[PDB]
Design a protein around this ligand. Sequence first.
Ligand code: HEM
Ligand SMILES: Cc1cc(N2CCC[C@@H]2C(=O)NCCc2ccc3c(c2)OCO3)nc(-n2ccnc2)n1
Ligand SMILES: O=S([O-])[O-]
Length: 313
Amino acid sequence: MNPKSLTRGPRDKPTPLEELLPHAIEFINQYYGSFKEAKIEEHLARLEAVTKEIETTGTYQLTLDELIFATKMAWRNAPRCIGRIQWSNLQVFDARNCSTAQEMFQHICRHILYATNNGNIRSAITVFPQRSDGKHDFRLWNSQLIRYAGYQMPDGTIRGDAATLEFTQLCIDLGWKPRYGRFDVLPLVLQADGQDPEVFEIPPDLVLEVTMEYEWFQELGLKWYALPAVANMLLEVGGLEFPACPFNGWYMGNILEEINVAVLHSFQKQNVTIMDHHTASESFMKHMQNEYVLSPFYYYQIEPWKTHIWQNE
Ligand code: HEM
Ligand SMILES: Cc1cc(N2CCC[C@@H]2C(=O)NCCc2ccc3c(c2)OCO3)nc(-n2ccnc2)n1
Ligand SMILES: O=S([O-])[O-]
């Protein structure tokens, strides 16, 4: 077999023009090929301008429409994603002129806001600036925008998310004051322009949680977040790399002390979208109505605290 790697790592120099140009040209062709006969003079015009822009600046910028096209195509090129069947239902937020972590934070708040929509979930992606030389990367160190903290008890026990134990400790190491619940929402750990990450609490009113509701099992205090958002992948398109491009959909669906009726009832009763038969038909219908090496592609990355060179720990 000759599978490709699903990971795209860091750089420390711009992509060499001899690599970038061919990829850029191929994407431009893919994009204008989305008409099948229309816009041959526009195609050639754009090919010439991109090639001149690359040769004069060392890189190039996508138009808004090309970016939107690229995020949707990357989505339908995601083999594992079940939601990609209705891939035209994606809202794009262009944050490519973002310069600071504070600004990153505000963009992310807007995303969570729009996407959550009081439970009537909407799919969205926010695209931050593309990699330049690889030393000014924008990154979210989170794996998800919303995820619970994980604590290892003085027993060797796991309290919270058993999968975030390492990231939670890194937040503490960065100044985040550890509460010790099993449902603590991790802060946003945001890197702008290649600099050390800054910690931002997520305003709690922005976090919609499904409180699970027999009758005594709500006494357990079982709870989960409504918005599944992937924070850590890199969007590749036409030779360009976007190391920060958080996106979301909605959900598909060990001290037990096993029916999923509690979750099924809690989500659906609290009007939080999930991928049931109603939503599947409704969303595919909206999708269909919108019709009036893989690339682009979402890559995995190397966890940034393993590769980051700290300016001033
Ligand atoms: C609209 C509702 C959506 C649903 C129901 C959905 C569902 C899924 C599911 C079930 C998986 C695999 C989960 C697992 O086993 O870990 C997945 C993976 C993924 N989804 Fe979605 N998704 C949605 C929206 C999105 C959006 C908006 C994007 C991107 C623009 C997207 C991109 C991906 C990617 C990149 C993966 C990872 C593929 C891999 O692991 O190789 N999804 N999604
Ligand atoms: C919070 C989250 C996690 C996630 N995962 C994919 C890589 C592994 C990670 C994960 O732990 N997945 C298991 C939980 C899960 C299952 C089904 C589903 C999910 C997450 O999002 C929508 O559909 N994917 C997504 N996702 C959102 C849209 N597409 C994928 N969100
Ligand atoms: O744009 S897709 O729906 O043809």
